[PDB]
Amino acid sequence: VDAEAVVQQKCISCHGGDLTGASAPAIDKAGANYSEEEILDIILNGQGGMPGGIAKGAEAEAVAAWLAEKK
């Protein structure tokens, strides 16, 4: 699944078009902070203001992996 397309219609909603943060902190370099597993966990189990399972399955996995690349 197109990680970027998903992000563009699930994450950026709060994280801003650019992942720079907006209504949520910057996840642009989540991959530098946390591995795909951890990012995936957060996507699945949300965190603080973030509700969980925003994306799911290959949607979530692709995003997590792609963000693992983003630093």
Ligand code: HEC
């Ligand atoms: C608004 C309802 C959000 C959407 C849509 C997504 N996220 Fe989010 N995220 C949001 C907040 C407010 C926070 C901080 C939580 C708190 O209150 O403590 C986060 C956090 C993350 C993180 C961890 C960053 C950190 O706190 O160190 C990651 C890795 C993350 N979010 C990823 C992520 C992705 C990929 C999303 C689309 C599937 C996504 N978020 C949506 C708010 C919101």
